[PDB]
């Protein structure tokens, strides 16, 4: 599908509310495998299971290993911009 830009708002006491799988060491994108109900990704409305996360706040995630992506994603705070695509 089309590449989308998606805004997510979170406070510092919560996580993003997603589960991710994949990573460059496995030859697969960073993929959203779960959206936790009621948490910030669910509330933002624009992120879905099956989406690949291509970038976050201008940081490219297309070539990142799994744990690299965890560190990058968990560092982001407040108003967070995602670049995502559903295949």
């Amino acid at each position: 599908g089309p590449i989308r830009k998606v805004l997510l708002l979170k406070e510092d006491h919560e996580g993003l509310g997603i589960s991710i799988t994949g990573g460059k060491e496995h030859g697969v994108p960073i993929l959203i495998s779960e959206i936790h109900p009621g948490q910030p990704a669910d509330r933002c409305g624009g992120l879905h299971v099956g989406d690949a996360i291509l970038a976050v706040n201008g940081v490219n995630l297309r070539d990142t290993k799994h744990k690299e992506a965890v560190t990058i994603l968990s560092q982001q705070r407040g108003e967070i911009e995602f670049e995502v695509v559903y295949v």
Partner: peptide
Amino acid sequence: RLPTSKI
């Protein structure tokens, strides 16, 4: 086998 992380 792929890893999964809750974040």
